[PDB]
């Protein structure tokens, strides 16, 4: 996260860290959507151009964390994965279309003050919250700047959703309805972005109707980080909800 600030304790209790078993390495963020299911970006698991193809036994998740690297005794919980599900139409060849994956935990995680699921939006929440100029919130332990830098605790930044024509004109990569972009415009006089290492982490919005946090996006891609006239791109969660629901219904 570029130009964010340190999270408060418990501020993002659905935040999940995806960790490679060996070498030990932070891969990506992720989010907790129930006691057994974690959402992330597909490219965190599968990206052949970088020779990346992880299965369940390669990975673990760490939940309830605040420090990036210290094991937070009696606070964080570690979960093995039973199974990974990547969206079958995930396009890694071109533009990371449908950049979304589910990971089923081997055992339910016990909730705590530090560990709690975020809501997924329904059609009404998505219609009313996902509008240009409304701000959501992105969290992660990824780079603090483009490299050409790692934070000691979870970073947070709030960013406005951007009109689709503006997103589309900012880049030559093909944008689809499965994506949205967020970030300040060059002369808005505020800054901030997700960056490498933040993929899979949630873009969330707090509903003014019921006071709950909904995960509207997944950190997916960008070109550099926090550049003027560029925006961060996010997987559009509600657009892919039929697939999410299909996987949870069939495989839980």
């Amino acid at each position: 996260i570029v130009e964010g600030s340190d999270a408060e304790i418990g501020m993002s209790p659905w935040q999940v860290m995806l960790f490679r078993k060996s070498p030990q390495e932070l891969l990506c963020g992720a989010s907790l959507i129930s006691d057994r299911w974690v959402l992330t970006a597909a490219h965190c698991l599968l990206y052949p151009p970088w020779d990346k193809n992880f299965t369940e036994n390669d990975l673990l998740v760490r939940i309830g964390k605040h420090s990036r690297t210290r094991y937070e005794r009696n606070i964080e919980k570690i979960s093995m994965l039973e199974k990974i599900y990547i969206h079958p139409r995930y396009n890694w060849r071109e533009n990371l279309d449908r950049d979304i994956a589910l990971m089923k935990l081997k055992k339910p995680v016990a909730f705590s003050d530090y560990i709690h699921p975020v809501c997924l939006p329904d059609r009404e929440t998505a219609a009313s919250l996902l509008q240009a100029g409304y701000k959501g919130r992105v969290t992660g332990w990824g780079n603090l700047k483009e490299t050409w830098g790692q934070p000691s605790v979870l970073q947070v930044v709030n960013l406005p959703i951007v009109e689709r024509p503006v997103c589309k004109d900012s880049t030559r990569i093909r944008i689809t309805d499965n994506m949205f972009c967020a970030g300040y415009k060059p002369d808005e006089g505020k800054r901030g972005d997700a960056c490498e290492g933040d993929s899979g982490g949630p873009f969330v919005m707090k509903s003014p109707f019921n006071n709950r946090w909904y995960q509207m996006g997944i950190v997916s891609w960008g070109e550099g980080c926090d550049r003027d006239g560029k925006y961060g791109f996010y997987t559009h969660v509600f657009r892919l909800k039929k697939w999410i629901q299909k996987v949870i219904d069939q495989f839980g």
Binding site: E8, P13, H116, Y134, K206, R212
Partner: peptide, 27 residues
């Protein structure tokens, strides 16, 4: 269930340091 309601915030009627900025953006 109680998805999206944080034990250390909404559940204790405490606001975090920057959520009002989100609320203001709807205005």
């Amino acid at each position: 269930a109680d998805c999206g309601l944080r034990p250390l915030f909404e559940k204790k009627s405490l606001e975090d340091k920057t959520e009002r900025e989100l609320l203001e953006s709807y205005i």
